[PDB]
Structure formats: C-alpha cells, structure tokens
Assembly symmetry: D2
C-alpha cells in the first residue's frame, strides 16, 4: 500500500505552497470516490476517519476497508484520525496503523490540552506518523486563536501541524465566511508550522487559495462531499424511485462526489504532486 506519513505530506505541501486535501470517509463508495479522484489527479491525499463514522462503522473496520480499496492505488495516501477527544481512541488509531492522528483537546483547559496532545505527539514522533492538535474552538455553522496561544501550544506540544480558529466552522455555512488572513500571516512568521483549516466545505475558492499562500497546508472537507454524494443519489431516486440497482443510485453519488473531490484537489494545488514522493 502506498501509505505515507501525514508529516511527510504536509511538510512538502507547506514548503511548496500547496495543501493536502483531507477528505472524510463514511463507507465504501465514499472511500472509492476519494481514492479514484486522487489516482486520476496524481495527487497525495488524506482520508479522514472521524467521530461520526467511528460511531457508525467502527475505527478498525474503516481502516481495514481503506486497506481493501488500495489494491489499484499508486498515489500517496495517509489515513488520518479526525476530531479525537480521547487519548484511548487516539492510541487505538496508532495501533491500527494510521499515518496521522488529530488529538482535539480544544475543549480542554490550555494546560490539559497541552498535556495530552504532547503525550500523543511523542507517540506519533516515535512511530513516524503525523500529529495534529487544535488550539481554539471551531464549532458548527448552527474566538479567533491568538498568536501567543498558538505559539505556546505549538512549542509545548511539538505538533507537526496545527488547527486554529480563523473564521471557519463545520457544516453548511449560513453566512459566507471571511477568514482571518492577518492572523494567519502573523502565525506563519511566529509559529512557523503548517496550519490546518477545519470547516473547508463551502469556503469561497478565492479565500482558500489565499489561505494556502499564508501557510494552510491541510484543508479538511467533509460536508461538501456528503452533499455531492447525496445530490447524485437524489438525482437517480427522484427520477426513478424504483431503481433498486445500488450500483446506479449509490454509484451516481460516488460519481458526483468524485467530481467534487477532483475539484478540491485542484483548488488545493495538489494535482500532479504524487511525483514528489516517489523520489
């Protein structure tokens, strides 16, 4: 399997002014949409196993399902644990052979977030896998992170890439977001680490491109892919409600989601970058 450390992918992106897309997986067809998109675009990609899919399918089953679909894939792939709020769950992902983990301690006190994130980072560093932490809460579409908090957190935790609160939120945006570009620029010069953008779904393309120049090197996309999938399925079933061939109904969802992943890969500037990791 062409699996690569998240640290390897993200550092390369950060050093070359592009971002790795971190695409959330939910089942077989969503895994395939992402992998086929990456293989077509010759792009390194992160597949994110997050809290919701863990609750539905299980952490280890989702890892094993990715493994099963890697047979024809030659591009760099990193399996990433998203939004973990448990040291135990994070260690389960490490034991299951993930290539990146996020311990999200953003709801803990600063000191407690530091303590657990550092413990996770030490494990990740030991095993050559990527580690993400978060300082500053990112909520739902339903507190911009300070430079000081981000620097202190980064230095005490030794995280490889850092999620910060910079004007995004998870879900479909009610109001169009406006990213804290000035804050990102300060962090580039002070924190000097790759930044992770949570809540990438529905952020205007122009703002993504700008954010990447300022050191965003991982962009998380989940909702926009599930919307694309749901649109494809809906199209089939609204037109032909007695279409019972899943290869048609869910396969159209797969196709529409694959197009969306291709769109994001290109937005992020990650197309063609697979070549950089062969040698």
């Amino acid at each position: 399997m062409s699996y690569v450390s998240g640290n390897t992918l993200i550092q390369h992106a950060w050093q070359h002014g592009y971002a790795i897309g971190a695409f959330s997986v939910h089942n077989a067809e969503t895994i395939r949409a992402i992998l086929l998109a990456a293989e077509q675009e010759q792009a390194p990609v992160m597949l994110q196993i997050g809290q919701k899919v863990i609750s539905v399918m299980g952490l280890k089953p989702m890892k094993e399902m990715i493994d099963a679909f890697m047979h024809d894939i030659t591009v760099p792939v990193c399996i990433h644990l998203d939004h973990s709020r448990s040291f135990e769950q994070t260690m389960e992902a490490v034991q299951a052979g993930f290539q990146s983990v996020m311990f999200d301690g953003s709801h803990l006190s600063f000191d407690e977030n530091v303590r657990i994130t550092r413990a996770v980072a030490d494990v990740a560093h030991a095993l050559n896998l990527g580690v993400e932490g978060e300082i500053g809460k990112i909520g739902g579409t339903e507190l911009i992170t300070s430079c000081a908090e981000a620097l202190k957190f980064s230095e005490l935790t030794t995280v490889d890439y850092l999620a910060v609160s910079i004007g995004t939120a998870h879900g479909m945006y009610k109001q169009e977001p406006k990213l804290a570009f000035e804050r990102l620029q300060e962090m580039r010069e002070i924190v000097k680490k790759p930044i992770v953008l949570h809540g990438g779904s529905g952020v205007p393309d122009e703002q993504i491109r700008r954010a990447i120049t300022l050191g965003v090197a991982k962009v998380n996309v989940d909702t926009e892919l599930r919307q694309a999938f749901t649109q494809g399925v809906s199209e089939v079933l609204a037109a032909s409600p007695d279409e019972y061939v899943l290869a048609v109904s869910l396969g159209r969802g797969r196709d529409v989601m694959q197009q969306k992943v291709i769109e994001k890969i290109r937005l992020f500037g990650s197309q063609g970058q697979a070549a950089a990791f062969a040698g």
Copy 2:
C-alpha cells in the same frame, strides 16, 4: 471469524427442514444489515458476492470488507460466490478464502457444464468449502429442469447443493410465480440433495415454506433487500432532501434492509439455529 463451510450449513438445514438465507451484499451498509440481522436472530447465514458487486467493488475487496465487519459477530457465516461463469473467477474466490462457490454453467452445453462444475467441485471438496452448480436456465422477470438432467448432472459433478429451474426468475416479478412443487418432490426422492432456490425475492411466503419442506435448503435473496434499502434511503431524502448525514440517509436504508433480512431469516426457519453449529 465464525466462518463455516456452506456444505456444513446447507446439509444441516436440509436434514432439519429449514433453509439458509443467502443474502447478496453490495457495500458496507448492506453487509452490516445482513450480519446484524443474523446476529439478532441467532441464525446461520450466507453472504453472497455476485457478479454485479464484483464489477463495482471487486471480489477480494468485498471479501475483505466482510472480514472487517465480522468483529462482533458470533453466528455461523458463509461467504458465497454467486453466479460465476468463469473457472478463473471461481478459483479467485477459493484463493480469497470463500466458504462456498457457485459455478453457474447453465448457459453451457450439458457436457461442458458438467466438466467445469466437476473441476470446481473437486477443488471445493479438497478445501472443505461448499460447491453449488446449476442445471437449467433461470432468467429475469423481464424450461423447468427435468429429473433426469438434474440426477445425471448431480451425480457427475458431485455438487453439494443444486440450483434448478422450478418457476422462479431474478428481479421484481411481473406475474406472481408458481413453483413446480411436483418437480421438487420428484427431485427430493431421486436426486437426494439440497436444492437452491434462485429468484427468492418476491416469492409468496406460503410457497417458500412449502418449497423448503420439499428440500429447498438455500434461498437466494438480492432484489428484495436492495428494494428495502432504497425505500429507507428514499424516505429520508424525499422528506429532507438536504439531509447530508449519510449515517441518517443510508443508515435508514440499512435499518429497513435489516428488518427485511430478519423477515426472511424467520420465513426460512433459520432463526435460533446458530446453536446447532457450536456443538
């Protein structure tokens, strides 16, 4: 993994006047619907990997996906290759560690069907996995098999269980089927092997119960499960077209399909029979 030879399951069913449900799988949620149904009902089950899913997801990936979802399952499970028209593909399933294979030579000449089916049977017998063959064409809802053809075929091939044409077809039935009960009765006394009913979707419950008494010991169900799945998905998306949580839309499909599998397990008389295979 609690995996069991298809021959072991089917002989027990046949000897005890019940049938093993052979439920076709298509993706993660459909695997889970079947396994959760079997675990709840304490029923032995066959999961069928057929031609359409092979074309979409791949033979080995679907096997590996079942393996991934077996973590919490304690009932007897048999992975079965359905509708194979290739010696090569059948051998791939054997190598991938399936517990039953069907070589469907029903479109070949009698002698050619015998020749290849026997070759597959010898491999299956060697490795303690079940083998199914078919004599007589079974088409789509868009030639009842003779006793003589069934006996000769059965004796020359050494198949463990036999598919015959007895009034069923694949797909949604236009006209209600009427099974060839007299023919089944003759076969019970002459062929003296368990019979497989293809085209189990939409057959009246009373006719299934009667057929099982006459020696049907495997009932194949695919379309009716995909209909149930599609109904659940459709319900969510017709009510809430912007519901993008797959755990809700596809999970309702999973739930409605799980209820249908439970309904079939009970129809077949396989509920509670898991106990018979522990010891």
Copy 3:
C-alpha cells in the same frame, strides 16, 4: 488466536499465589517448544521477545512468527517485549500488537525512569496491554531495592508489574543466589503489585516457590531454555555429525527445551490455570 493481556494474566497469578512463566523466544523451534509445553500443561504463558532476538530476527518478524504458530493453541498467550531501553522500540511493539511491554529505565536517573515508564504505562493502559517497569539494576552473574523507592516508583509510573533487585542476576549463576524474601514480603504489603523476577534461570526451586508465595507472579526464563535447546542439538551432532536432517538435530533441541518449559510451568504453579481464563 487465544491472546490475553499481560495484566490479566499476571493479576490472576498474583491473586491466586502462582506465577506466569515468561519464556524468551529466539526462532521457530524455540517458539514451538514453549507453545507445545503450555498447550500440554494447559497453562497461561508469556513469550518474551527481547533485545538479542530483535537484533537477530527483528521485532515484527518475531511477532508474526508467533502468530504463525498459534494455529493449534488454545491456552492464554501473551507476547511480551523484554528489556526495552527505548521509548521508540516500546511503541513499535505496541503498534505490532504485543500484549505486554517492559520499559527498562533502570540505567536512567530515578526521575527520567519515572518519566518514560509513566508515558509507556499510559499507552499500555489505554490499549489494555500489560506494562512492566524496573527500579534497581539487575546485572549479569559474572543493591537490593528498598520498599520505599519501589512504592514511589510504582505510584508515579502506574506500572502493572514491577521488576526489582532482590538477589538475582541474568546468565549462568556462579554462586548459588539467596533471594531477599523479607523485602519481597514488605513489597507485597506496601507496594501491593505483582513482582517480576529477572534472572529466573538456575535459581533453586525451593527459593522460586517461596518467592511466588510472597508475590512474585512473573518469572523470566531465557538462558536455561537455550541451554536445554543446545544440549539436545549437541547430543545429536556429537553422536552423528553427518546427521543433516534438521528435524532430528534441531527437533531434539526442541524436545529437550519443551521438557524444560514443562518443568518451569509446574514449578511456577501455572499448570491447569488455562481453565480460569
């Protein structure tokens, strides 16, 4: 595969006044000797992958070789990393799916031993595997740990089982050892955790038995098994130097080692205890 947490095994031993034998593995025949002994005796066992075999065969290859030989085994088995002095190597064993790890920080300062041992313990507890640490150096056969130092170490690290310096050493004993029984008893009552005996090869049987009743619940055996193996091989090759059937020469080593493992299982009081799990 009948794999069980080291903590589950050792706690049960400690609770019931017996010990789990921790038998060091080196290759295929040594793995088989141990597993066949355990299966015959219906005994829980630990198979220890230590530093020498890691250097020769590799950590992950040795794990996978154990897996390969578990096909016909029904007794509880725990794969244990022995004598790790590296956080990185200890994490490698965790990722490879070991059921117990020893971080041996005994050559570090107390503070640094506590720091790294605690980090390993946190990982082990999260994943339901056993964790061993060591306070006080245990050397070669060619200095007793205090109760207070053992308590402080134990409480700060949260280890499941603890190696202490109690009168043993690794290798062939020059002089006959004398264990610190009274110290063991104090630890049993104050530290209240299972004690691991390093240097179990060649200790008089009566002293082993006594140590186990006083709360030694894991006994490490390596040298005595390699001696048994080597004796069996030597016997064949000295008698028939042109015996080229490895099934005969190395198989006799396997047989003589298997008898030794059976002997240790019984010494430890672990025979029949598979039923409890």
Copy 4:
C-alpha cells in the same frame, strides 16, 4: 512483498539460458540464509516448502514465516510446494497463496498422473502460479525418461516446467552422477519446456552448467544446504559446547548456509537477474 509467479521466473531463466535455484526451507534461520543470499546476489529465487518441513512445522506456518522475513527483500521470490503427492495438499498451498506448486504423480500410473497433474495445472493457470509435474521416478542416492513419454505427459498436463529422470537422485551421492545430456537436448527441442533437475545437491558443477545450457531452468537444492547449516552449527558446538547463545551457534549455521546459497546462485547463472523483473 516482491513475490513472482514461478512460471514467470522459470520461463525467463529458460529463455535466457540460466536456472532459478529452488532452495528448500526448514525454519527461520534457513529462510533468512536463502533470502539474504538472494538479496546480496540480486538474484530471483524459489523457496521450496517440501514434505518434511510440512510434517514438522506445517504448510501454512512456513508460508507465513517466509512472509514475515520478506520485509527488507527486493528481489523476486517464489514460494514453491515441493513433492506433493496429494491433490488436497496442493490445493492447500494454492489457497495459502503459493506462487508455484509441484504435483508429483510419478508413483502413479501414467493415466492417473496425467489426470491429477492436469487438474492441478488448470487451477495454477487460472491463478497465475507456476505448475510442475514429474514423469519418471527420481529416487534416493542409496530409468531415464524417454522424450516421447515426456512430450505426451507435457501436452496432456499443460505443466509449465517438468521434472524427468535424467541421472540424478535425492540425498548425498554415493557414486558421482552422469547426466543424460543428449536426452536433455532432445527434450529441449521436442518438449519445448523448461526442465527441472531434482537431486541438485552434490552434482559436479560442470555438469550443472552444461545441463542449464541444455534447458534445465530450475535446480532443486536441499541436502547440500542442510549440510552447510549443520557444519556451521557443529563447528561452534564442538569448539564451545557451553555456547548457549543461539545467535552464535545457529547464526554460524545460517552464515555457512548463506555462503552455499550464494555459491549455487552463481553456479546457476542467476546473479544480477533480479534487474530483468
């Protein structure tokens, strides 16, 4: 893992006038000797799992042990079932993911040998693994196959490579063998398939070289490797009977066996040929 069909390897050897060495494995150290030799020589190799090791260690455990030791190997490797006289056992190797199988029907009637060998071949061809059969018995060192019988057998069975009786035998040679070179040449031109040489241990080097130029493209070596292994072990234990470090005693066996495998790789003309795959 760099695993390659036996047919792919043997065809390439035959096409280019060299042979693949088929080295019998028995345990961890023997596997490592062979793999390290192949990796050093950048040579494609076959590792043969035969009847004796199946009886001792098991078919599937030996496969899994090879897998465990492939972590650092980049050369083409083919795991081959040797001397199977059971359709069932041959199917077990297929299911365990071997890259080549030998069904040895040479003790059966011609018709029955053809029948079972053909059935095995059909399975092998379907799954892209190599298949070997045998016409004419090859015994122990303590009768030449005809060209016509070899052609009929070959055409009916569709084997990829064929073992024939050509002047060799298994074990330590009592008398020096003399191969049937002219018969080999006839087979090369009429049968037009790669020939397998059983009993490769102890055959004079010049006769091996000549046989390979005449279309022998797989050479089986077992006894000579076990002798090399046994010599290394014996050396250590005779000199230092209380040497209990298996890394020393069995490691010397490994080293001496590795040198022997290197010697055979070069003899066969397979060094450097990894580049071709």
